[PDB]
């Protein structure tokens, strides 16, 4: 029995921003998906292309866990075919995504008085991101016709800070989202459920 690092992904101290989401590779371990239910206050548990009950039966080659922090309103944008600042410029799921999305309210950990400005999201970009594309560029977005040099008129920084506070509303509180991507490639299935 070799338990997967799911504990290191879900119970991490600090999470990554949505424009710099940390993708962790899960391989050569036993994927005990029942341990995920230890975080009972789950805001959403929606699987696409797979069933949560039949998840312990299927074997996969690589399991990609994408973890980031967004707000409550943007949790709906984490789904195939969604449109928004996060689903276009930060993190886009393909139309045939096979996996599950897990989110829970983190107003106790990620929130902070005087604003928790350690989490950022990309609001401006030249074009929409491709599925599973990551862009950590900090180049100033040129909204106008004049050349781009320094912040000013029509020259905006492409990243914006959330600034989480504990007294925010349920829609603006921080929500830690973990996206589990199950890949079945032409390779031996190293990841399987507990037997």
């Amino acid at each position: 029995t070799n338990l997967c690092p799911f504990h290191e992904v879900f119970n991490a101290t600090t999470f990554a921003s949505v424009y710099a989401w940390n993708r962790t590779r899960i391989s050569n371990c036993v994927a005990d998906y029942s341990v995920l239910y230890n975080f009972a206050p789950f805001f959403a548990f929606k699987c696409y292309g797979v069933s949560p009950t039949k998840l312990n039966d299927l074997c996969f080659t690589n399991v990609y866990a994408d973890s980031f922090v967004i707000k409550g309103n943007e949790v709906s944008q984490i789904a195939p075919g969604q449109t928004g600042n996060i689903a276009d410029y930060n993190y886009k799921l393909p139309d045939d995504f096979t996996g599950c999305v897990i989110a829970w309210n983190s107003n106790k950990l990620d929130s902070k008085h005087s604003g928790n400005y350690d989490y950022w999201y990309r609001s401006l970009r030249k074009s929409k991101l491709k599925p599973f594309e990551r862009d950590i560029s900090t180049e100033i977005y040129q909204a106008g016709n004049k050349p781009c040099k320094g912040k000013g008129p029509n020259c905006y920084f492409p990243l914006q800070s959330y600034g989480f506070r504990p007294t925010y509303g349920v829609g603006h509180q921080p929500y830690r989202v973990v996206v589990l991507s199950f890949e079945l490639l032409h390779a031996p299935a190293t990841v399987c459920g507990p037997k």
Binding site: G115, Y141, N154, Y156, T167, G169, V170, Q173
Partner: protein
């Protein structure tokens, strides 16, 4: 790229930053109002300075986006809200002088206290002093002395500053492409670029005059009734054909005639409905009152209160350990934070006030999805009307019997209904001529119709001709009656009250038709009516994204102020007052003792 996309990106950035900065400022203000300390004052001042600097910087950046090259109405409205220069168009010296004059008038109104002439050491301030005096005293000489002193001491001092204030405001408004300050105030009702829903600033005056022409008969009958009652109460001081004296109106300025209910009560043998004793017997607290209000708002289909509302709101006085301003206000800190600051105690008035504040909170929660600059009522009276319709629906005897405060065997007789209608009239219809006259006087002073040497004269003339109020003491040109008012001395609009009064009864008529109410309009309860709730939420979610005419058409089916719902509401009281005044004179003459 086109200018529209650049403007959209600028608006997105502005909204993102303004949400956070306004949340910080509102949280500082809440911490100050909930705990009056020097540190909280300094924090609130710093947050307000940061917010004002942000608005000043963002307003300069928005000047590069021409309004003519923007086709999207939402973006155009946001840019119009951002491109407003305000007091920054004048020179630095003129702006500093205007701010100093405003602060000086505010301090004169706030620090102004009246001392007795016989005892110079015995002085009385405004609120626990002259207000309590004019509220319950029935002495002609004492009320006359108070009314004269309040505008002889505080007056004759603000007018030398009020004239320079008017001059500076006119210069500022003309610099902002307006005709005068009256146009700057009426600009909130201006709708441009929407075919069929446009509304000019000059049309507002015409509509207000047209509505007051129809209000005139009901107010005339109410004035005749009040005059007869006061003559029965104040012998040898009231004329059956003349105007009413100013100091005997139950208020310092004559705005609300509510305090005259003790003398003008139709049937004093039966007290009005007061569920204070029932709430005391059933051991109700602030939490119970707000839960009842929440159930009322859920019954019509509106969303329930958030958990942060129950957690962070101050529903009870924190005691002597914390100093708080016990003024009931609805707080919209933004980003999902909705709070209510109210020192709730066991009182039916507090029940109605909690309903009003929860209606304000529901309005705020409705347009939360709108952009930051559009997160406000479609008009300056929409919030007040939404609060007042809920206050009316809560005060109905049917709702009180449903919630278990009135006895189930309580019968609603005609005389109790007449007393309730007369009280509501003294509260609502009594302030409409006063508001109309005050706003018209301010407008004509700003337009230059009364330049320097006829302010007080034309003020008293308009008051006699409109409100029917005669001067008990002949005031000369050195006095200034309008400056004695809080809203006039603190630079606030006043037509908002007339507009919200009309919109209140319009919304009430619309929701009672949507709820299929049979009977008088004052017996209507919109409880357990999801149709009225949805019809109201269709307007509450709009905000300033769409013109107020479109929202008014969505609610009541009309694009302008209609006073017919108010007349339908007061029709039983009108029929009773007709029979009461059949044996009395109707109207008032403009000539009486000075």
């Amino acid at each position: 790229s086109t200018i529209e996309e650049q403007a959209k990106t600028f608006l997105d950035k502005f909204n993102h930053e303004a949400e956070d900065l306004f949340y910080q400022s509102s949280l500082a203000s809440w911490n100050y109002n909930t705990n009056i300390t020097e540190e909280n004052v300094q924090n609130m001042n710093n947050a307000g300075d940061k917010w004002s600097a942000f608005l000043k910087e963002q307003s300069t950046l928005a000047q590069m986006y021409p309004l003519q090259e923007i086709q999207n109405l939402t973006v155009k409205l946001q840019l119009q809200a951002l491109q407003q220069n305000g007091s920054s168009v004048l020179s630095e010296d003129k702006s500093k002088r205007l701010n100093t004059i405003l602060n000086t008038m505010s301090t004169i109104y706030s620090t102004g206290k009246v001392c007795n002439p016989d005892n110079p050491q015995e002085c009385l301030l405004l609120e626990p002093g002259l207000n309590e005096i004019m509220a319950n005293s029935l002495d002609y000489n004492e009320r006359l002395w108070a009314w004269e002193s309040w505008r002889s001491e505080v007056g004759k001092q603000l007018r030398p500053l009020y004239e320079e204030y008017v001059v500076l405001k006119n210069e500022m408004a003309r610099a902002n492409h307006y005709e005068d300050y009256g146009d700057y105030w009426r600009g909130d009702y201006e709708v441009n670029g929407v075919d069929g829903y446009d509304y000019s600033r000059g049309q507002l005056i015409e509509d207000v005059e047209h509505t007051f022409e129809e209000i005139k008969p009901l107010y005339e009958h109410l004035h005749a009734y009040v005059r007869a009652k006061l003559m029965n109460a104040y012998p040898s001081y009231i004329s059956p054909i003349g105007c009413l004296p100013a100091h005997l109106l139950g208020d310092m300025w004559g705005r609300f005639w509510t305090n005259l209910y003790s003398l003008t009560v139709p049937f004093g043998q039966k007290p009005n409905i007061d569920v204070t004793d029932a709430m005391v017997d059933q051991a109700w607290d602030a939490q119970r009152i707000f839960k009842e209000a929440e159930k009322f708002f859920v019954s019509v289909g509106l969303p329930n209160m958030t958990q942060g509302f129950w957690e962070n709101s101050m529903l009870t006085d924190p005691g002597n350990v914390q100093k708080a301003v016990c003024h009931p206000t609805a707080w919209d800190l933004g980003k999902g934070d909705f709070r209510i600051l109210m020192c709730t105690k066991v009182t039916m008035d507090d029940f109605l006030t909690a309903h009003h504040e929860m209606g304000h909170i529901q309005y705020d929660m409705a347009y939360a999805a709108q952009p930051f600059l559009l997160r406000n009522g479609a008009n300056e009276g929409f919030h007040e009307a939404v609060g007042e319709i809920m206050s009316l629906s809560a005060a109905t005897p049917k709702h009180l019997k449903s919630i278990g405060l009135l006895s189930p065997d309580f019968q609603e007789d005609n005389e109790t209904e007449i007393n309730f209608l007369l009280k509501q009239a003294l509260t609502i219809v009594g302030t409409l001529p006063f508001t109309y006259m005050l706003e018209k006087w301010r407008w004509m002073v700003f337009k230059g119709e009364i330049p320097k040497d006829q302010w007080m004269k034309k003020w008293w003339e308009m008051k006699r001709e409109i409100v029917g109020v005669v001067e008990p003491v002949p005031h000369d040109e050195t006095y200034c009656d309008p400056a004695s008012l809080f809203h006039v001395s603190n630079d606030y609009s006043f037509i908002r009250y007339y507009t919200r009064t009309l919109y209140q009864f319009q919304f009430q008529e619309a929701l009672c038709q949507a709820a299929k109410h049979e009977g008088p309009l004052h017996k209507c309860d919109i409880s357990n009516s999801t149709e009225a709730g949805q019809k109201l939420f269709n307007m509450l979610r709009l905000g300033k994204s769409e013109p107020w005419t479109l929202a008014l058409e969505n609610v009541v089916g009309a694009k302008n102020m209609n006073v017919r719902p108010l007349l339908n509401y007061f029709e039983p009281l009108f029929t009773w007052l007709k029979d009461q005044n059949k044996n009395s004179f109707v109207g008032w003459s403009t000539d009486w003792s000075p």
